């Protein structure tokens, strides 16, 4: 065939899209216990009946959790048993032979899902597929109990029967490709934006103010994000696995939490800084020295380390359930699992306490601007819009993740993994936004031009 280019058309990548890969036992749309790539364990409502059938199939005590390797072997067995089921049947084999490669997979898909016996019950639709009446079979199949239970999956399989191509599955890979370049643009923006801020402050003797000393720290935290955290996370998602062993998996995870903490806590420190800088400028200038500020920065990074490298390297963050035990053992797994204790304690430090202070402080600013020595004019609206961007961008990017992070702790299975990762990535892009928020000063503006000779 000479084909090693992506998206070869077959039943394996087709079902992987319809079924998905889930290592721990779950319930399908009907309520039956399924595991791996669409493997029906049992129809018994008991979870212990499910586990007993699973242990019998795998050959060991699994505790409801199998490995990737075990999941794939179950997959191929289930596919081969579907193909063997088709060739053994008297209604499936005549139709199966007379189908093309693409429409053979569409049949296997149905058999794989609702069994050999069930599929052979489609007398009319099989009669149409045999006589090559694809569009009638397509209309007809859409009138079944199968179409009402899993419509999204049925439409794809029906479309595969009608068109005879992989159109309904072809697009799925394009979106992975589009995803990959966007990640690149994120990394680029975070790196370029923050390397600029740090250079501007280090090089120009005039951006050497206390507030900028906090900006530098925020810019440093965002810098390590786009260099270490964001790219490695991108590769982890794109390649579906982790190829740097267990040590760098928890080292990377440590850098993740470290920089997110140091970033948000600095945003908090900046808000407080600007409160005193604005409300009481004479006390602010005399009390807050550059040495005192460099101590504040150290402490923010120390707290950050305490909530990142310390619990993680000492494995205190670790969960105890079987799926977490297996992933910790697997050199190619780096999924994130924590206990209630850590996920709550880290969230309060990394996000919630900074959030509260920032909401409080920025309120005290707006509220104290009303009670100064003073028409409802222009300058106040533009100022209110500024903190609306300052506080709005922070909230919109990090709040949805840390809420969901908590909800996943309270009630398990409530948040699908895809969402938890997307919302985490919406938090990552805040590192790109910050240089557009905290560096609009006329001094930054001038420095930015001279640095790149515009």
């Amino acid at each position, epitope marked *: 065939d000479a084909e090693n280019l992506y998206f070869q058309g077959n039943i394996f990548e087709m079902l992987r899209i319809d079924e998905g890969l889930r290592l721990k036992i779950y319930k399908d749309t009907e309520g039956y216990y399924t595991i791996g790539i669409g493997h029906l364990l049992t129809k018994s409502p008991s979870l212990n009946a499910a586990k007993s059938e699973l242990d019998k199939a795998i050959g060991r005590n699994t505790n409801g959790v199998i490995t990737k390797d075990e999941a794939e072997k179950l997959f191929n067995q289930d596919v081969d048993a579907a193909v063997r089921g088709i060739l053994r049947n008297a209604k499936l084999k005549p139709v199966y032979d007379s189908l093309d490669a693409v429409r053979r997979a569409a049949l296997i898909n149905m058999v794989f899902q609702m069994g050999e016996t069930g599929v052979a019950g489609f007398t009319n639709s099989l009669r149409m597929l045999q006589q090559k009446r694809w569009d009638e079979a397509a209309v007809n199949l859409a009138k079944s109990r199968w179409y009402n239970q899993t419509p999204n999956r049925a439409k794809r399989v029906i479309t595969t029967f009608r068109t005879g191509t992989w159109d309904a599955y072809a697009a799925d890979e394009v979106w992975v490709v589009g995803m990959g370049i966007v990640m690149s643009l994120i990394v680029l923006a975070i790196v370029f934006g923050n390397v600029l801020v740090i250079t501007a402050i280090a090089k120009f003797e005039r951006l050497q103010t206390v507030t900028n000393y906090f900006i530098t720290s925020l810019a440093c935290a965002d810098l390590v994000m786009g260099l270490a955290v964001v790219p490695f996370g991108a590769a982890h998602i794109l390649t579906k696995t982790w190829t740097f062993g267990n040590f760098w998996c928890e080292f990377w995870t440590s850098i993740d939490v470290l920089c997110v903490t140091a970033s948000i806590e600095t945003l908090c420190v900046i808000a407080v800084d600007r409160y005193f800088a604005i409300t009481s*400028p004479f006390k602010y200038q005399s009390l807050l020295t550059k040495n005192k500020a460099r101590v504040i920065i150290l402490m923010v990074w120390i707290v950050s380390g305490l909530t990142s490298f310390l619990p993680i390297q000492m494995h205190w963050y670790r969960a105890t359930h079987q799926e977490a035990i297996n992933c910790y053992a697997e050199e190619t797994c780096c999924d994130f699992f924590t206990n209630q204790a850590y996920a709550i304690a880290s969230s309060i430090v990394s996000f919630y306490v900074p959030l509260v202070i920032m909401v409080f402080v920025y309120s005290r600013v707006f509220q104290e601007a009303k009670r100064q020595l003073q028409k409802f004019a222009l300058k106040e609206h533009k100022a209110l819009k500024t903190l609306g961007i300052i506080m709005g961008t922070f909230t919109l990017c990090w709040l949805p993740f840390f809420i969901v992070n908590i909800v996943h702790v309270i009630q398990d299975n409530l948040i699908r993994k895809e969402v938890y990762i997307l919302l985490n990535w919406i938090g990552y892009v805040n590192s790109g936004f910050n240089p557009l928020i905290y560096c609009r000063s006329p001094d930054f503006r001038i420095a930015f031009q001279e640095l790149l000779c515009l």
Partner: nanobody
Amino acid sequence: QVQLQESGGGLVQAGGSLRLSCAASGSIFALNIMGWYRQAPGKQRELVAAIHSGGTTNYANSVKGRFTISRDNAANTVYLQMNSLKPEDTAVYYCNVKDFGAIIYDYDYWGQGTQVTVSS
């Protein structure tokens, strides 16, 4: 796009009194620092007296006890009282406003400048 009108300067005898005055024409943020800076002959620009929108003040260590800054009700006008004038107070006095519209940084508005000459 606001303006700063300065007035009050001129010639004055040693030990004489003088009253600078600056009015801010335009819309300035409710939180700001309105004050005066000066450039002595052949010396750098130095803060003289400043006043926060919240009332509090600040002075250079060479004008404390002699110079006093105050402001108006809502007209945003600032008056600088300069008593016991010395020859080292001979300079160019600029009226300044630090507007905190952006929160993160501060926007400076300057005055045109007014000369003050003390007869040594």
